[PDB]
Amino acid sequence: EELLMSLKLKALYPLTGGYNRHSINPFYEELVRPTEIKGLWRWWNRVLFNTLAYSTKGKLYTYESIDRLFEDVFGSENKKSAVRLEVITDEGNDNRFELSYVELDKVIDCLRNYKRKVSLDFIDNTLIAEIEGSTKIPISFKSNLDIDKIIKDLVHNNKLLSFELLGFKSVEIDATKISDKKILKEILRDLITNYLEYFNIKQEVTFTLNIYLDKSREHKQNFEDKLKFALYSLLVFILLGGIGRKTSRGFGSLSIIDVKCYDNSICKKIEDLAKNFLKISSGNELKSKIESILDCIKNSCIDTLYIENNILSEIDPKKNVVYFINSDLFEVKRINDKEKVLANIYKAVSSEGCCIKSIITDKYVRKSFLIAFGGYRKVEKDKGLDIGFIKNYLCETCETVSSFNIVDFLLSEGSFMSDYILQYEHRNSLLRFKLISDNSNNSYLIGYILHSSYFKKIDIKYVRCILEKLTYCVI
Amino acid sequence: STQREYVFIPITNSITIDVKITIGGSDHITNIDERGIHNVLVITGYAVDEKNGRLVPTLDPCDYVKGILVAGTPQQAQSNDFLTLKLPANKLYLIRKKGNISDDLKIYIPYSSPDARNSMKTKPVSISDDTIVNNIIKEVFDKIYNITQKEKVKIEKVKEDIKELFSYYALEQ
Amino acid sequence: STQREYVFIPITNSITIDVKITIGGSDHITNIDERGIHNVLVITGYAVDEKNGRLVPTLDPCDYVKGILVAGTPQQAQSNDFLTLKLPANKLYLIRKKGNISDDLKIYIPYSSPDARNSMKTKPVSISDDTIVNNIIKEVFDKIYNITQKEKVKIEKVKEDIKELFSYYALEQ
Amino acid sequence: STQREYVFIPITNSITIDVKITIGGSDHITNIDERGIHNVLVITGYAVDEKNGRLVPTLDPCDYVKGILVAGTPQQAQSNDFLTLKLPANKLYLIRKKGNISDDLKIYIPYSSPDARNSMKTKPVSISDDTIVNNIIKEVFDKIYNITQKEKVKIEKVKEDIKELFSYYALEQ
Amino acid sequence: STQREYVFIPITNSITIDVKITIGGSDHITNIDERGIHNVLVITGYAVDEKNGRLVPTLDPCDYVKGILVAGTPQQAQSNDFLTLKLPANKLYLIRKKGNISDDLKIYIPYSSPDARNSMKTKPVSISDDTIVNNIIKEVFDKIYNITQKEKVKIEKVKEDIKELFSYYALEQ
């Protein structure tokens, strides 16, 4: 075993989770989970691979076979991983979340013989137990983690973050039946912890990502070639994706501070292509680099492209979904207020925000666009024609003014994609954002659209200059 | 805006109408056309006193007083039973938010002083014996808001909400 | 059909008035319906030159300028400082669009050319420094709608609205 | 360093050469070393009109036009159709970029005044008609690159490079 | 970083410090910031000789000499008793690792010469009798790191791990 390479990266406002869905907990703190890197690296490998397969073969391959193809690198049920990650985040402390005291016993007395719901809000460095039965009583707590002011701003001013607080902030309390205080004092006490821990957010989380090789994986078929392709999918993971939660909206965006390597025979082009991001100096100059890195994985420097192997499996378009990189939908602007655009992206992904109420100026072409691009949207098909008039935009074949047709989305009935694109509460967003920079103080927002397989076909330039105006008013 | 009155609504027949000329304009707070009583300002730290409701300023945060808001008279141009306090229209703890508010309001409330030699002993009592409903909705809603809630029939939404609108605690002395 | 002319918002000293006849009627390319302006226009690939405040074309898609299009001609004596396009506005990047513009638009944008003796690297800087915000509300905004600070409730918040909306690139040379 | 004029490639036969640049010196930007056309420059918000095509200007970012930048003296010592842009070589959009260009950059872009009193009505234009594809591969490429395209293997592969890369927009009138 | 130097922890302090100035910059490796003693180097196959001890080398992998590593100049350019080694920081064995370390480190560990006519026969010696640990505390910890250690509780804590976190083998001849 020996160290393959080292990637000193940084993350921008990462929302890394844990057992409690927060980056800190009563026991430890991890702002970077080496399990999420390995999990996302594999996700950005099954995407890049199907990109290399939808540019040289016109074929798409299922996930359970791409990793079966790469299991000699990332490992599987039949083989240990050949690469092993090791994240060494800086400041290397213990830094658990400790709640020293929380003086709350009036709100306890405000909660006898009643079924209310407590709700926490952080108003001017002080939190309030908003009993929806009209009692905004304050609380005098004292804890760690020093919420400065900025996160309190950043959370309240970002409509996405504030929307996900709706879980971690409130809970009903039935007390008409037998009640207590030793029990209520412990219900409310953790409700504080699960709330303040949501505010352990930090910009500029600097960590290293050491990647080791074992030197015991004999070159089965393309080991030396499968591996150096995985490094490519790791760079595009760094350059297009982030770690943590809501990375499809800019959070946890990754950068590159300095890349070393220790085996020139493999990492040669990878470190070089990675070296080209330490000194980015112009918006459309990076738009060239984003394409420079991508094409060197395509027809230029074709990394052994051994698709002619009996491991893969073509997908079924009417029952499978696959995400791959459309090399054309890419936009690199420039920004100087990360927090502003981080809160602006809500203007571009919400069905009422002041960026797509301008670009796609209607109800249906607006919503139906998000339904097919903005991940999964809560669309309640209990009202009138606004389930079909958005269907009329997303049919497989019907009267279309805009090209948002889905591979088997039929009207008057529901196929597999008909329910999937409509009722499946876990669907990633094809429209993504990422803020990237280092050593230049020149932050560049990046916008792109992952190409899916359920799309019948998409008018490239139309939905591009939709995305174009998008990335413009997001600043 | 300008002068406005916080009409707290218990079950009692004490100060039901109690209110002379309004602004004349319709810059009201609680209009209940068809979608339930909305923007129902209710305040904390007072008690209905169970009789001759003066809203004794209590110091229990658990304690509170509910009611409605409307730009009526200051008790036929009176001030000795008020607060004359000004609002920024964001430090008002409103219920069932409906967006639009003004910048400043001169909210006026029936006031009082602490009755000496008497522990307040605020006691929670909700709205019951609903014969008060047609007593108030005809008086404080059909004489204060008789443009909606009369040309409509969706007042069963209001009917069920009357008891489900104002709870209150009381000194009960 | 219609005539319009460009007025962006820098912090410079070249926005004095320098404008001929008003709308002719009273309809601008923008409106005021929320607490802030709407229908701001964007030209991509132009900077402000920070002196002699016309917009010189660049060929970088990362180049920002935005304002509101005032109606009318530029005195027909500076018949070369402006573009005078004619489009149905569907080829017009407009933000906070509140109206359907099916007719055609004569828009006159303060124009220039590099005549470059040297290089030209534009610099991004937005508006801040409150002394400037209420400074531009008095020589740019009391003249567009003839509605400001007479019966408004919005102007003081439009200052916040102008801050976060209008962002301009600048040569700074 | 010195002049680098920009030749864009529409369907039009007249906009083809009419040029004062053969090779200039020996420092080209759009080299055809192995993979055909590289370093393609894009112009955001400009049309060609297919007639008198010298980069007709618009404002819509949906409209974009590609071309080739060639180093030499701009078109008859005439300011009629140019911009004289001395750029810092970092505001450029080079599709298929390759090689490190210097910091200084003096490019020349064909200019047309906007069609006054005329609607633009720009239209997306890809390129087709393999015969006229057999035209441009000689019509310009072997008229600019005498030392190129005759003694390599990369001859017929520039066809689909032409077929894929070069799209643009036009007024269609 | 640049020139560093490791130094062992011998109970015999004939070479207690005998090393010259700090970085010249502001970067150490070991520190006692709040919790405990951080990065501590362990090299293998080196006995001290504890008599002008400068890490006599041997081939036994049983031997080791723990000890802090500070970025000091090698004893005002002492050209006799160091190893002047540069390493990519991956070849360093750090007990109690804390944070990432630099790209390459030029360390000068005290290197005596492997002597002849004397079989090594090294015997391990550990720390005990806490009047031996304070004879080391101020000399090499509260001198090199003589800014803090008079501000926090970390005084006895440093004399906790000194008893065991720094063991070694000795030639004992």
User: DSSP string spanning A422-444?
Assistant: TS-S----SEEEEEE--SS--BE
Neighbours of A461 (CB within 10 A): 17
Angle between helices A34-53 and A223-240 (to 10 degrees): 110
Q: Which amino acid is at D117?
A: R
Q: Tell the residue number behind the tokens 């001609």, with chain if given.
A: C73
Torsion of CA E141, E147, E149, E150, to 10 degrees: 140
Could you tell me if D27 and D71 are in contact, meaning their C-beta atoms sit under 8 angstroms apart? yes
Q: Is A82 exposed, middle or buried (0-12, 13-18, 19+ CB in 10 A)?
A: buried
What is the length of chain E?
A: 173
Region of residue A13 (left: phi > 0; alpha: psi -120 to 50; beta: else)? left
CA neighbor of D30 nearest in space, from D86, D68, D71: D68
Q: How far apart are CA A461 and CA D122, in angstroms?
A: 14
Q: Which amino acid is at B61?
A: P
Chains that touch D (3 or more CB pairs under 8 A): A, C
Q: Which amino acid is at A340?
A: K
Q: How far apart are CA E68 and CA E30, in angstroms?
A: 6
Cβ pair C116:D84 closer than 8 A: yes
Cβ pair C85:D44 closer than 8 A: no
Q: How far apart are CA E1 and CA D95, in angstroms?
A: 40
Residue C60, classed as helix, strand or coil, is coil
Q: How far apart are the first and last CA of chain D?
A: 38
Q: Which two tokens stand for residue C121?
A: 């690297």
How does A139-153 read in b/e, with b if 16+ C-beta sit within 10 Å?
bebebebebeeebbe
Could you tell me if D36 and D161 are in contact, meaning their C-beta atoms sit under 8 angstroms apart? yes
Task: Give the list of residues 6+ apart from residue A58 with CB closer than 8 angstroms, or none.
Answer: none
Q: Is the dihedral of CA E27, E33, E37, E39 positive or negative?
A: negative
Enter the DSSP assignment of E141.
Answer: I
Enter the DSSP assignment of A262.
Answer: S
Q: Is A70 exposed, middle or buried (0-12, 13-18, 19+ CB in 10 A)?
A: buried
Min distance A124 CA to chain B CA atoms (Å):
12
> Which run of H or E residues covers position A340?
helix A338-344
For the CA atoms of chain B, what is the radius of gyration?
16
CA neighbor of A175 nearest in space, from B132, E26, B124: B124
Residue E85 pairs with which residues in a beta bridge? E107
Q: Tell the residue number behind the tokens 């002492």, with chain if given.
A: E78
Q: Which two tokens stand for residue D168?
A: 């643009």
Q: Tell the residue number behind the tokens 């070589």, with chain if given.
A: D89
Q: Which two tokens stand for residue E10?
A: 């011998």
Q: Which two tokens stand for residue B141?
A: 């809603």
Q: How far apart are CA A246 and CA B115, in angstroms?
A: 57
Could you tell me if D89 and D107 are in contact, meaning their C-beta atoms sit under 8 angstroms apart? no
Torsion of CA E67, E69, E72, E74, to 10 degrees: 60
Q: How far apart are CA D136 and CA D166, in angstroms?
A: 12
Q: How far apart are CA E120 and CA E171, in angstroms?
A: 6
Q: Cα–Cα distances in Å, from E146 out to A475, B121, C83, E139?
A: 49, 63, 70, 10
Residue C105 pairs with which residues in a beta bridge? C2, C87
Q: Which two tokens stand for residue D134?
A: 């057999």
Could you tell me if E37 and E27 are in contact, meaning their C-beta atoms sit under 8 angstroms apart? no
Cβ pair C96:A333 closer than 8 A: no
CA neighbor of D92 nearest in space, from D83, D80, D105: D105
Q: How far apart are CA A129 and CA A135, in angstroms?
A: 7
Q: Encode chain B in three state secondary structure.
A: CCEEEEEECCCCCCCCCCCCCCCCCCCCCCCCCCCCCCCCCCEECEECCCCCCCCEECCCCCCEECEEEECCCCCCCCCCCCCCCCCCCCCCCCCCCCCCCCCCCEEECCCCCCCCCCCCCCEEECCCCCHHHHHHHHHHHCCCCCCCCCCCCCCHHHHHHHHCCCCEEECCC
Q: Let me know the angle formed at the C-alpha of E41 by E36 and E45, rounded to the nearest 5 degrees.
A: 140
CA neighbor of A364 nearest in space, from A395, A392, A384, A396: A392
Q: Which of C42, C93, C96 comes nearest A354 by C-beta?
A: C96
Task: Give the list of residues 6+ apart from residue D26 with CB closer than 8 angstroms, or none.
Answer: none
Min distance B163 CA to chain A CA atoms (Å):
13
Q: How far apart are CA D143 and CA E135, in angstroms?
A: 87
Min distance A466 CA to chain D CA atoms (Å):
8
Task: Give the list of residues 6+ apart from residue D81 with CB closer than 8 angstroms, or none.
Answer: D54, D75, D110, D111, D112
Cβ pair E103:A260 closer than 8 A: yes
Q: Which residues of chain A have a CB within 8 Å of the CB of B61?
A: 106, 110, 135, 137
Cβ pair B62:A136 closer than 8 A: no
CA neighbor of C99 nearest in space, from C122, C69, C57: C69
Residue A223 contacts E, CB cutoff 8 Å: no
- E runs forming strands in A313-443: 323-332, 405-406, 431-436
Q: Which residues of chain C have a CB within 8 Å of the CB of D59?
A: 41-44, 85, 87, 91-93
Cβ pair E100:A208 closer than 8 A: yes
Residue E168 pairs with which residues in a beta bridge? E65, E125
Q: How far from chain centre, in Å, is Cα B86?
A: 17
Cβ pair E35:A8 closer than 8 A: no
Q: Cα–Cα distances in Å, from A193 out to A93, A169, A200, B6?
A: 20, 10, 11, 37
Phi and psi at residue A189, to the nearest 5°: -70, -40
Q: Which of E35, E88, E97 comes nearest A94 by C-beta?
A: E35
Task: Please indicate whether chains D and C are in contact, defined as at least 3 beta carbon pairs under 8 Å.
Answer: yes
Q: Which residues of chain A have a CB within 8 Å of the CB of C167?
A: 475
Cβ pair A281:D93 closer than 8 A: no
Q: Cα–Cα distances in Å, from B136 out to A251, B12, B23, B43, B164?
A: 53, 10, 21, 20, 14
Q: How far apart are CA A395 and CA A399, in angstroms?
A: 9
Q: Tell the residue number behind the tokens 């932050």, with chain if given.
A: A443
Bridge-based pairing of strands D46-47 and D94-95 is: unpaired
- Which of 129-148 (A) contact D at CB < 8 A? none
- E runs forming strands in chain C: 2-8, 32-34, 36-37, 40-42, 46-47, 56-57, 66-70, 85-87, 94-95, 105-108, 123-126, 167-170
Q: How far apart are CA A327 and CA A295, in angstroms?
A: 8
Task: Give the list of residues 6+ apart from residue B145 with CB closer than 8 angstroms, or none.
Answer: B28, B30, B31, B32
Q: Is E68 exposed, middle or buried (0-12, 13-18, 19+ CB in 10 A)?
A: buried
Could you tell me if A450 and A54 are in contact, meaning their C-beta atoms sit under 8 angstroms apart? no
Using a CB cutoff of 8 Å and minimum separation of 24, what contacts does A422-430 make? Answer: A422/A371, A422/A379, A422/A381, A424/A376, A425/A376, A426/A376, A427/A375, A427/A376, A428/A248, A428/A323, A428/A375, A429/A248, A429/A249, A429/A349, A429/A373, A429/A374, A429/A375, A430/A323, A430/A372, A430/A373, A430/A374, A430/A375
Q: How far apart are CA B7 and CA E159, in angstroms?
A: 71
Cβ pair A92:E35 closer than 8 A: no
Resolution in A: 2.8
Could you tell me if B34 and B156 are in contact, meaning their C-beta atoms sit under 8 angstroms apart? no
Q: Which two tokens stand for residue B68?
A: 């409605």
Could you tell me if E33 and E149 are in contact, meaning their C-beta atoms sit under 8 angstroms apart? no
Q: Which residues of chain B have a CB within 8 Å of the CB of A110?
A: 61-62
Torsion of CA D93, D94, D95, D99, to 10 degrees: -150
Q: Which residues of chain A have a CB within 8 Å of the CB of B64?
A: 134-135
Cβ pair A110:B61 closer than 8 A: yes
CA neighbor of A249 nearest in space, from A38, A460, A453, A445: A445
